[PDB]
């Protein structure tokens, strides 16, 4: 019956998947769900005035399919001990109200504008980032999300994504040992 559910959010390229993976390998009976696995097909993505595909919005995501994956994990978690841990990591978690009571802990990776743009440029997407995509869409949708975070009623731990991978792992691991 009992579970421990962790949210890891933050801007694109802030190290969410990396952190989730480092935690998983050190925590027993731990799983990870990635929001990145639940994008709608390209044809269902809206395009704005400037021709920018709206990927960085809840409407780009099949959150019904994501919820069923979380329910599948819970059912598995029930038979996993003869406390199971789930880590949900993704760029748009904490503004999704159906999940607002799920979080036992809530982490938010932050990196500044320049570093985010730098990392984002080293990654190859499907389809590739158009020129101007970061300034015309990615960063604006991020600031909109941070504005939406201002009415979150529960505690969120903001993490500095420019710290080394191990530094971030230890910081979160130390926090978790104290919460579990
Ligand atoms: N602590 C860190 N410091 C610097 N770079 C990192 C760190 N963690 C991950 N990265 C790198 O930044 C990029 C984004 O990492 P990833 O974990 O995929 O981010 P996200 O899941 O938030 O998109 C990758 O190239 C990855 O190797
Ligand atoms: Mg990721």
Numbering used by the authors: 1 to 82, 92 to 189
What do the paper's sentences say?
To dissect the structural basis for specificity, we crystallized selenomethionyl human Nrk1 bound to Mg2+·ADP and solved the 1.95 Å structure of the Nrk1 monomer by single-wavelength anomalous scattering. To understand the basis for substrate specificity of human Nrk1, we prepared a selenomethionyl form of human Nrk1 and grew single crystals of a complex of the enzyme with Mg2+·ADP. A crystal, which had the symmetry of C2221, was subjected to 0.9793-Å synchrotron X-radiation, and produced nearly complete diffraction data to 1.9-Å resolution. Single-wavelength anomalous scattering allowed location of Se sites and phasing to produce an interpretable experimental electron density map of the Nrk1 monomer prior to model building. The 1.95-Å refined protein model includes residues 1–82 and 92–189 of the 199–amino acid polypeptide, plus ADP, Mg2+, and 72 water molecules with B factors between 9 and 37 Å2. The guanidino group of Arg132, the ɛ amino group of Lys16, and the hydroxyl of Thr18 coordinate the β and α phosphates of ADP, whereas the hydroxyl of Thr17, a β phosphate oxygen, and four well-ordered water molecules coordinate the magnesium ion. The adenine ring of ADP lies between Arg128 and Glu174. Accounting for the ATP/GTP nonspecificity of Nrk1, the 2 carbon of adenine is solvent exposed such that the 2 amino group of guanine would not appear to preclude binding in the same manner. In the absence of NR or NMN and in the presence of the ADP product, Asp36 stabilizes a Mg2+-associated water molecule.
In one pathway, specific NR kinases, including human Nrk1 and Nrk2, phosphorylate NR to nicotinamide mononucleotide. NR kinases are ∼200–amino acid polypeptides related to human uridine/cytidine kinase 2 and Escherichia coli pantothenate kinase. Nrk1 consists of a five-stranded β sheet flanked on one side by α helices, E and A, and on the other side by helix B. Additionally, the monomeric enzyme contains a lid domain consisting of helix C and D connected by a 12– amino acid loop. Thus, human Nrk1 and human Nrk2 are dual-specificity, NR and NaR kinases.
